[PDB]
Design a protein around this ligand. Structure first.
Ligand SMILES: O=C(O)/C=C/C(=O)O
Ligand SMILES: O=C(O)/C=C/C(=O)O
Ligand SMILES: O=C(O)/C=C/C(=O)O
Ligand SMILES: O=C(O)/C=C/C(=O)O
Lengths: 497, 497, 497, 497
């Protein structure tokens, strides 16, 4: 059975990244099912620490640890075992009364806070990975379009000539700062609240540092109230998602206008567009609009979470709103979709140049030339060139057809006086590519300036990947260190007891 | 004329911090009037750079710079001159046509982005200052209440014994992370977009680094589109305000419950409470409720800003929502009010202790003691002690009156078997102060543990103040460097030209 | 296997309404799966109308209609068939090329708008039913507590004496107005956009009224753009949900304070409370806090939907955010939970009376008595009684122990003059039940006044149920009328063709 | 001094409605100053009722009423007198101790709730007036453009031919339903809470109906708790503002795309456009973007209000967020601005027609013609015409140049078979005006169908104005009835006492 939406102008298959936008909602896990595997890691790390602190015997610990493996497999198909007390009771039915001792010095409150942090932690690295891939495609695309002259817009009106590469590097700088936000957030998510128990700690002599290290945390949530009442990292995760996706909506919207039947300065790759069930001419920006949809929806969790925090005391509370898997899955799908949109975008270079040459985005350079050549102030030069545009539009004269006669008329009609410039000055001022070349300072569209920004971004991207690789490897090491400690307890018991 | 609200139980005057909550709304500036002084600084810094780049003659520059001082004073009483083009036109009427040259290589777009950043920058240091003062009062208050035994709550139910000092250090840790958020934000606000002009830079050879340095920025917004389209720092400023104030609402709510007629474990200082026009018995938490009001209201700008970014392209746009002075003023007023609330709070130490001793928050330690002494698992010990509580409540027996007989009954009724513990074990387990002393690990309420957290917080507070002092001094130095460069141009012209 | 959370003080099973709060998230349908059955109703109603308009032959219509039944059953187990074009293609594979004719004069745009309206329509009647059951329990509970004297609070401080019945009838009036909001919304949801096709209608001679009537709509969305671009009913549905649940959060919060260990003026029924895995004394308000959680979360869809509308043009758009089943399911679960909370709530009548008599909520009546008996203005009487309270608190004198001596002292100390009232006047003024009886105007807590409000509410509830019964029956009639028309076409073909 | 922004292409003056967008922020009142005049009306109405109930003597009443006039005039220049207790104290200093008796049976709680309702009530009629003027301009504009053929868009892609009049009547239907929302809200705002006093009523025998009638309310908020705790009408006012403005943003956005340099199918009137300080060619949609800005900002109050309600109990609370004058003023300014935008919009009729004829929006009619003429199913006809478009685009053939040859090729290439249609069938199918004429059902763009919608809208507008006139006159009558009752008391005292 084929994809029934790939009819008419919707040729070929959906790009896989495009298809993600349609699949994440039905495939998303509940928070309970997403967090459960991390809870079972906490059970092991907590039991190991209890053993090392002499609170559990090795026999007790080994019996518990082996039971966890059994119940975990039961919970793979029995969802009722994915919350704590049902899980603890199933462990009791599996290994006996000793199961109850794994909760010594512990509560559902610090267990849940820690487990949710571990889930958000992995999802944050997953997000940073996707955002890096987004930035990579943006920069790589820019490197191929240093000569792609086109107009930049302000207030949805043509402003001045730039290049497509110059535009994309604005997105690169946006993404660099959102990656900073995410990395800054990671340092606050990756703190271990275990040891706070209900909210006040415990009399049992826990080693909170050992539990934290075994679970991959880089530090503690120290105060025990903050350990269970702390929720700002959840709100912040929701916010960075929201603000990052607002910039993704803006690019999607920008490309959607580029790809209107009226602009026709860019076209979506067939693999990122759909069509209509009724209108055969439609090549619809489904990828862009469903990406924006996800950006709008990300407003919801942010408001729900902050509302819930505004509604309570500084306590553990079951009334706090969560950041759910389906919200994060939507962000990833949208980020992947726009990664592919950018990679496969087809700019219409000729029409881009045509607009730059014909639709008066070069008038600023004409104004600047008057100021530079004859020394009038900018406001006076501005009034003259404005008159040029008004007259040119009235007469149907494209910007690249503006000449000495029209400029002299405007100056006379506006000041009563001619103005001392040549037809070559005017010609050079109205050449959109010369407009680009002259804008060669930092962050400006001249190829050498955009090229420099690309070089800096490629260096920053290397550091982005390095930060991600180190954070990921640190978690993998701790997770392996924990698995080793678990088997060693089990082997010690099997061998000597 | 006296404060007519200070009647009956509302004795004395409002604390000044309390009064701030009533004054900020009517006293708040428009964004235009708040940003205008920074725009005039930009005019000077931009003109200086134009002069150093040989774009303006010294005569032109000096004439402009002296005119700015004149128009600035006019704008002190003529609000119509607080937007750019009216200001430029007034400068033209004051010094002549040369006024128009101060806009060379510049736009309202990068002028406004930079000016708003300078405003938010100062307001961010103002906020960091206030939050530091908030944390100082919280830590200083904690240092005086290491022995103030009281219950901590979870889900608005008494949980376990702690101390007031232990609770306040949860707030200290919350504020430390919000100070990190604010400092992280500062690095993104303190970037200079000047030189982007409309959105694509300019052909004029500007020195963007010089303009940035003269205005106190620590770096550039490089890409010219990002310079004018960039708005994420505004959304982020709104967010940190929102999440920080949500924690302030939670403390306000916590104290409001403490100070209910039913809890009576704390009382507001008369200078932070009001009364009713009809009910003479009322001592109302006006300070707390208007502080929460400001926290709820801070949700608004965050949503408005993010909505506006989700609604546009990655362009300069006049449709973007701003963070306004009155919102920031509300945060400061609430932060100052809660600073004073915490400083002057009157805890009722005797009733705090009474609840800890009588209302069963010590049952966990009783449970832990069974596990420790006889070795039963925690779940079984938990069921027994639960039976103790049920029976004690039925019989009207306060927790500190629970003895050997009642514990043995519960064990028998629940397991058919007695349990091997002494009356001294039970007595020690139900002593709320011993509950506190036993919780002596990291972040737990034992005095030595809270004392350690205070010591660390005092060290962190020293670094908070140091970061603030350095950031503030850097702006003062640049502002003085700019004033010097302005006079030197004016003096050079007066002397030689 | 038993409910492992029902341990210790969590006796018995969860009330079913309580359990709903734990089940709705994992059980919720996607919007696609929830809307799909309504789409298949639209296919039938649209085909019937095409037949009656002579666009389809009876043979064609009968073949299509019988195929719909076959594909519907396939889609019961094949989720891929729950969007239109896969469904249309499966119908094609089932009955042949004629399947494509069911889309004549139609689009996915007006099909989806109509199908989602039908879904929200049924969910709105479901919500109105639940809210009615909520109000019924509130009023019925009030009828049993006309004598249950207790204090009302303002700003979380005891204010004046009322009754529990009086408080609950405030909730009844709140719910009456939310039922008006919902009924007003229903009239805007129950409009049929079918016939708009893509956005501009069609050349085919459709009978839009017939399609609308067959699907239970009470009218048309006339303009074809509004038919597909119209989305305000979705935003409004989200809003009424949000504001209704904010009042439910406020009642939940009110009861949670009542049931604190410090108030102890009400207690949750065991079937609506939980306990702690660590603290055996906990009787936790899980029902209340998860109900508030749902109220906070309802903020999310409202913001997401409105953001998406603010982000587009007045067009059909795939970027619009939806109101999803899981959000509505959460509201129902919370409404059912609070319905049972109210029904089974255990007020502590004796302690309610004690607070009313002892904690100075009667001071207003004492003030009013001075004004009435000696004729002083209210502000002067207020200052005297305030002095009474201050002195009584200082001396540890409960309000019901205030006598002639203390009142005369305050008057002297405050005015230098005694005051002409008797000890019987004071006694009557400080009697909390007399406070209630004297408040006998409209909407006041006196039994006869609350009884009147109950009578009016019982009459309004009869009209609520009548409106719901009529709306529900109208849909059932249209749905049966449609099923009949479908079989008749099928029978006509089988018999004559 | 001229408007310095009216330079270059920004010719003439701003339209006054355009200028409103720049003035409302600095001119907006605080809520305190906006509500104060209504509070003084309440003082009079409450005193009158106290007199009629025999609680005040005529001498007392007359002395108070005359003092109110004096203090009101003082408060015109002394803002400190615009809150109750300062006002009451100034009245005391003016007429003596008797001033305190105006507060008998009353609180700041029900005074403030009622006063804010009266303010929102007037602002709601002001809003309904503005929205009516908005709808009038939309319908009147539509009546002049029944022949203005143009394409409608879906997903920002050309869809099918319509007319400008047809598009505007979608807005008319949107506004009709928002007027229903506002009128429905009015019935809930226009309820009087006076008589609730603090929250529990009073022992004084007030006539709540008389006070309500004197102040223009159409009924009571009955229950006294609901009278002071009730806030849903504030949230609802914020919501209708938000959803109404979201539709205004969508029209603004739609027109902004129409007026891009690339569409060029409409142009703003010079009086609703601005220009750039740097780019002389700019004709900027400042009116549209600042209108959308106000729509985004309206999200803020809605979220702040609902958050505050979610944060409290069902009590009077000072923590509740308000709907402020500046938010309402922004809506009015945006509504007035878009009223003028629509009135003065310059459609480019020739280019509108050109797009309709050339850019393939007529392909649906071509598809429908195949189905109608040869009887193939719609999906097969759709695939053929899709092939026509693909081939036509490849060959650069405008839609109106598609002929018999190209259609036969597509049919052959796609089915191997020709198709039995004439060149005249194709020609008629591709004629965009015939596309419009054929869409003649209800709500479709055919002139006779749009004309009918206009006739119905003109009838509905007459009823809109009639509802507004009646509501306004009812308030004017009550306000005059109150002024008369005040003088009569004053005259009775002056004459006989
Ligand atoms: O699939 C449809 O029926 C319409 C799609 C569109 O609006 O382009
Ligand atoms: O000032 C009043 O009238 C009431 C205050 C309160 O509710 O406590
Ligand atoms: O279930 C727990 O571990 C704690 C519950 C509570 O905070 O009361
Ligand atoms: O006024 C300016 O400087 C730029 C305006 C624009 O972006 O069009």
């Amino acid at each position: 059975v084929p994809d029934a939406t790939r009819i008419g102008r919707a040729t070929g298959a959906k790009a896989p990244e495009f298809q993600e936008l349609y699949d994440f909602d039905a495939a998303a896990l509940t928070l309970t099912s997403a967090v459960f595997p991390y809870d079972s890691q906490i059970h092991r790390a907590h039991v190991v620490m209890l053993t090392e602190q002499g609170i559990l015997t090795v026999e007790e610990s080994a019996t518990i640890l082996s039971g966890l493996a059994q119940v975990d497999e039961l919970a793979a198909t029995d969802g009722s075992l994915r919350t704590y007390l049902p899980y603890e009771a199933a462990l009791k039915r599996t290994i006996g009364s000793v199961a109850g001792k794994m909760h010594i010095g512990r509560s559902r409150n610090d267990l849940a806070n820690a487990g949710k942090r571990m889930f958000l932690r992995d999802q944050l690295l997953r997000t940073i990975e996707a955002v890096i891939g987004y930035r990579e495609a943006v920069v790589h695309k820019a490197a191929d379009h240093l000569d792609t002259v086109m107009v930049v817009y302000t207030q949805r009106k043509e402003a001045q000539p730039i290049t497509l590469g110059h535009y994309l590097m604005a997105i690169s700088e946006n993404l660099a700062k959102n990656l900073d936000r995410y990395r800054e957030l990671y340092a606050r998510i990756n703190l271990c609240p275990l040891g706070a128990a209900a909210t006040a700690g415990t009399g049992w002599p826990l080693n909170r540092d050992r539990t934290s290290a075994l679970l991959g945390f880089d530090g503690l949530v120290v105060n025990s109230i903050e350990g269970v009442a702390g929720w700002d990292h959840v709100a912040e995760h929701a916010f960075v998602n929201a603000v990052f996706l607002s910039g993704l909506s803006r690019l999607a919207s920008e490309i959607q206008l580029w790809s209107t039947d009226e602009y026709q300065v860019a076209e979506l790759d067939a693999s990122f567009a759909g069509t209509s069930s009724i209108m055969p001419q439609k090549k619809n920006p489904d990828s862009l609009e469903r990406s924006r949809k996800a950006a709008f929806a990300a407003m919801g969790p942010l408001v729900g979470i902050l509302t819930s925090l505004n509604a309570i005391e500084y306590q553990y509370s079951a009334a706090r709103v969560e950041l759910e898997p389906r919200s994060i899955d939507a962000l990833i799908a949208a980020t992947h979709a726009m990664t592919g949109v950018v990679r496969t975008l087809h700019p219409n270079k000729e029409r881009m140049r045509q607009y730059a040459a014909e639709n008066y985005s070069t008038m600023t350079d004409l104004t600047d030339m008057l100021v530079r050549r004859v020394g009038i102030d900018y406001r006076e030069a501005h009034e003259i060139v404005a008159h040029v545009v008004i007259t040119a539009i009235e007469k149907g004269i494209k910007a690249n057809k503006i000449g000495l006669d029209l400029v002299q008329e405007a100056a006379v009609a506006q000041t009563g006086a001619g103005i001392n410039v040549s037809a070559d000055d005017i010609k050079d001022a109205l050449d959109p590519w010369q407009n680009v070349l002259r804008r060669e300072g930092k962050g400006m569209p001249a190829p050498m300036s955009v090229k420099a920004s690309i070089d800096d971004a490629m260096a920053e991207l290397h550091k982005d990947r390095a930060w991600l690789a180190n954070a990921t490897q640190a978690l993998a090491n701790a997770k392996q260190t924990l698995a080793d400690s678990v088997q060693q307890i089990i082997q010690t018991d099997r061998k000597y007891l």
